[PDB]
Amino acid sequence: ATVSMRDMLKAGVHFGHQTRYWNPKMKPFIFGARNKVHIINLEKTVPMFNEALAELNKIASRKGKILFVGTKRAASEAVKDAALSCDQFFVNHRWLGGMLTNWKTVRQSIKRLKDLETQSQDGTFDKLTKKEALMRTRELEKLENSLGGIKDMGGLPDALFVIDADHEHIAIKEANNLGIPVFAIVDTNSDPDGVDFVIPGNDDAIRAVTLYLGAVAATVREGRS
RNA sequence: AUGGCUGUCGUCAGCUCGUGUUGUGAAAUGUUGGGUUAAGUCCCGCAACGAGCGCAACCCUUAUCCUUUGUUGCCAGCGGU
């Protein structure tokens, strides 16, 4: 469902940030000054969206491992339901500084995650005492809280969808070095560099993120067939 | 000129590494910060993610109960004193 303007101009995706907070590189994607707040010009959003949608489909058509990034609070579970529905990965909690570039080490910690889920899959934590077992639920729970829906990755992904390029620039900086293409919903408060397939507009509204993630969930599910 | 061995800082809680990242570089980050602890003890957060020597625990003794055994050990309950 590649939206054009209908529910786009109804959820508040045009919006942006204060003229006190705007980043100078967002000059071309601007139209509006409603009460000293920058409004994105949608005329170069939907075409840019569809071109990105096309390339995201190309990756998914060749069985590309798509990895989302919706780390912030008001996107947490939103990205999660919009990820496991399209059988792809996601980064909903704090990004582990040095995840992809430091894959050599995190791979071993994620190996531990599969192992720990094993004793809790059939129930063999009760072999030892309760408090000691309570300890392994603390680690395991925190382990699946951070590296949950990424445990079945197998290596480096190909499609990195990220929300709020300025707040999650760490993921972008790691995806720049590996030549891995990254797709971001760049806010007027963010920076378009680092990301090749930039998409201007808002990323703060809860309704708005469902518009983006909803549309991309479709592109992958059609590229699988 | 040394090995082995010991003292001291001090039984003070600190000392480092692999990988990644930042800086031309020495190095830094991790090991900073908010709390907390006898203790980088623990939690949360964090360009850091894990790991090692350390603190703890495991060790011996002491403090209560229990089982087994009853001599040269023991004396309640019964005889003889």
Curated annotation (Swiss-Prot):
Gene3D superfamilies: Glucose-6-phosphate isomerase like protein, domain 1 (3.40.50.10490), Helix hairpin bin (1.10.287.610)
GO MF, one annotated term: zinc ion binding
Coiled coil spans: none
GO BP, sorted A to Z: cytoplasmic translation; ribosomal small subunit assembly
Keyword Ribonucleoprotein in annotation: yes
Signal peptide region: none
Protein's UniProt keywords contain RNA-binding: no
Disulfide bonds, paired cysteine numbers: none
InterPro entries xref list: Ribosomal_uS2 (IPR001865), Ribosomal_uS2_bac/mit/plastid (IPR005706), Ribosomal_uS2_CS (IPR018130), Ribosomal_uS2_flav_dom_sf (IPR023591)
Pfam families referenced in this protein's UniProt entry, alphabetically: Ribosomal_S2
Assigned GO CC terms: cytoplasm; cytosolic small ribosomal subunit
Residues recorded as bearing N6-succinyllysine in the entry: K114
Assigned protein family: Belongs to the universal ribosomal protein uS2 family.
Subunit structure: Part of the 30S ribosomal subunit, contacts bS1. Some nascent polypeptide chains are able to cross-link to this protein in situ. In collided ribosomes contacts ribosome rescue factor SmrB.
Protein task: Required for ribosomal protein bS1 (rpsA) to bind to the 30S subunit.
Name of the protein described by the UniProt record: Small ribosomal subunit protein uS2
Annotated source species: Escherichia coli (strain K12)
Gene that specifies this protein: rpsB
